[PDB]
C-alpha cells in the first residue's frame, strides 16, 4: 500500500520550572521508531523500533545534533510567539509541529506536510504546493515574513521531496516484515441485553495493524451511522489496535443487523451477525 513518515515536535514552556522542554518522535505509518527528549540525562535521538537500530553512528549523531539545535530554536520560538501575542511571562505555552511525506506503493511522493500549532490552534502551515504558506493570524504573519525572508519553504520542499522520500523507502525495506505486513482484525459480535425490549450488539475488532479500519452496522442493509457508537481506535501495546462499534436493537430484530469490517489485512471485507 501507501506509506507515510511523520515527525512530531512538541515544545512546552514551564516558567519557574526550568527551560522549555523539547520532545521529538518519528513515525512510519503507525509505528514509532525514534524519540528525543531534552529532559533526558543524556539527550539523544534514540531508537524505538528494531529495524532502525542498524543505522550507524553518523545517523544517530546527525539526528541528535539537529534535535539539540532544535531544543534551542524552539526555546527562542516560544519567547518570540509570547511577544507576538502580548502574553505574560507567567503562562505555560506549547508549539507543536508535524511534518513528513506520503509516498505511493511505487515509492513516489504523493504530497508533503509541515504544520505548526500554538497552544493547540493552527498557527502556520506549508501549503500543498510546498512553496507558499497559510498563516492563521497576524502573529503567524510575522513568522511567515521571517520564513519568506529565509526562503524556508525551499529548504522544506528540498527535504520533503528528497531525504523524506528516500529514507522512508529505506525504512520500509529495512522493516518490511512489519511495516509492510498488514495484520487483519480478529472479529466477533457480543450481545448484551439492556431491558426486556432492547439489547446492545457490539462488533469487536482486535489485533489489527495498521490502525486504519472501517466498522459499521447495517439494519436491512442500510448503514446505521447516526445510531452507532464507535470508540476511538486504541493501541493494544503490541503494535496492534482495537476498536468496537455498538448498536442498540429491539429484542428479536437481531438478525436484521450486520456488522461490516474493512481492513487491508483482510483478503475480503467481512460481514458479521450475532451468532447466538
Amino acid at each position: 500500500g501507501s506509506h507515510s513518515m511523520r515527525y512530531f515536535y512538541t515544545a512546552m514552556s514551564r516558567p519557574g520550572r526550568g527551560e522549555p522542554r523539547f520532545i521529538a518522535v518519528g513515525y512510519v505509518d503507525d509505528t514509532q521508531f525514534v524519540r528525543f527528549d531534552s529532559d533526558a540525562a543524556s539527550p539523544r535521538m534514540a531508537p524505538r523500533a528494531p529495524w532502525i537500530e542498524q543505522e550507524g553512528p553518523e545517523y544517530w549523531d546527525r539526528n541528535t545534533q539537529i534535535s539539540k539545535t532544535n531544543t534551542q530554536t524552539y526555546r527562542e520560538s516560544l519567547r518570540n510567539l509570547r511577544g507576538y501575542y502580548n502574553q505574560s511571562e507567567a503562562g505555560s505555552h506549547i508549539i507543536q509541529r508535524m511534518y513528513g511525506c506520503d509516498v505511493g506503493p511505487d515509492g513516489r511522493l504523493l504530497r508533503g506536510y509541515d504544520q505548526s500549532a500554538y497552544d493547540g490552534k493552527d498557527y502556520i502551515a506549508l501549503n500543498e504546493d510546498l512553496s507558499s504558506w497559510t498563516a492563521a493570524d497576524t502573529a503567524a504573519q510575522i513568522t511567515q515574513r521571517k520564513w519568506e525572508a529565509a526562503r524556508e519553504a525551499e529548504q522544506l520542499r528540498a527535504y520533503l521531496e528528497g531525504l523524506c522520500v528516500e529514507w522512508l523507502r529505506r525504512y520500509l525495506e529495512n522493516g518490511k516484515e512489519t511495516l509492510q505486513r498488514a495484520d487483519p482484525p480478529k472479529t466477533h459480535v457480543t450481545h448484551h441485553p439492556i431491558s426486556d425490549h432492547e439489547a446492545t450488539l457490539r462488533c469487536w475488532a482486535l489485533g489489527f495493524y495498521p490502525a486504519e479500519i472501517t466498522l459499521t452496522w447495517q439494519r436491512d442493509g442500510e448503514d446505521q451511522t447516526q445510531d452507532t457508537e464507535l470508540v476511538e481506535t486504541r493501541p493494544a501495546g503490541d503494535r496492534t489496535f482495537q476498536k468496537w462499534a455498538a448498536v442498540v436493537v429491539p429484542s428479536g430484530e437481531e438478525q436484521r443487523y450486520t456488522c461490516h469490517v474493512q481492513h487491508e489485512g483482510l483478503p475480503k471485507p467481512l460481514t458479521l451477525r450475532w451468532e447466538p
Binding site: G26, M45, Y59, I66, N70, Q155, Y159, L163, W167
Partner: peptide, 9 residues
C-alpha cells in the same frame, strides 16, 4: 531521518 534544523518562528 530528521529535517535540518530550521529558522526560529
Amino acid at each position: 531521518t530528521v529535517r535540518a534544523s530550521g529558522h526560529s518562528y
